[PDB]
Amino acid sequence: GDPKRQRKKYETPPHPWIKERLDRERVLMDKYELKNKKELWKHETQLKNFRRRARRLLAARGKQAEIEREQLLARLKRLGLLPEDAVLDDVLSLTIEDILERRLQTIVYKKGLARTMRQARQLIVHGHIEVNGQIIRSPSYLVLKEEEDTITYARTSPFANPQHPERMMIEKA
């Protein structure tokens, strides 16, 4: 037969020019400051995978099914997407905005590190942000709940100084 070929991790729309879909996606793209559509589509696929796993396990029974059920719940509430008392049904009520809120860019903006989304993106890419003692330069990285509060300026960065001119302007807001 044929050996393995690596496949894409996102899915494209079935019709490229549908007015309502274009409007909705434009709203999301502008609010969260993503570079291109495929980035957005990547996150959409993640959500669908979660949903597809929940639909399959509601209809299953046996010993392996229960293991996978608790594994799904644990992984979901480790990422910070569910409260610690949620049940399998609550998986089906997740939305795309829940996933986009977990990006490192969004979290850097909400914690007050930067004044804007775009400034947060640059802060990440140039290497001024550290997560749990380690520098990460991917704005799309999904942040675990257990490490959310150890997010700071890198200890070697210019911004790790309360007198830096650009840091002061950020504090001003």
Partner 1 sequence: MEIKITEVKENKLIGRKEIYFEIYHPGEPTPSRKDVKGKLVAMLDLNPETTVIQYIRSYFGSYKSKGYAKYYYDKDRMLYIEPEYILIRDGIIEKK
Return the bridge partners of 153, or none: 129
Q: How far apart are CA 166 and CA 104, in angstroms?
A: 21
Residue 17 contact, options RNA, partner 1, none, Cβ 5-8 Å cut-off depending on partner type: RNA
In the chain, what's the furthest Cα-to-Cα distance?
Answer: 65
Options 136, 142, 151, 170; binder of partner 1; rule CB under 8 A: 136
The interface with partner 1 within residues 3-42 (CB under 8 A) comprises none
The interface with partner 1 within residues 139-158 (CB under 8 A) comprises 155-156
Residue 22 C-beta: closest distance to RNA, Å = 5
Q: Looking at beta carbons only, is 64 or 85 nearer to RNA?
A: 64
- The answer to whether residues 97 and 78 touch, using CB atoms and an 8 Å cutoff, is no
Q: How far apart are CA 163 and CA 172, in angstroms?
A: 12
Residue 78 C-beta: closest distance to RNA, Å = 5
Residue 155 contact, options partner 1, RNA, none, Cβ 5-8 Å cut-off depending on partner type: partner 1
Size of the site for RNA (CB under 7 A): 62
The full 3-state SS of 88-131, as one line of letters, equals HHHHHHCCHHHHHCCEHHHHHHHHCCCCCHHHHHHHHHCCCEEE
Contacting positions for partner 1 (CB under 8 A): 127, 130, 134-137, 155-156
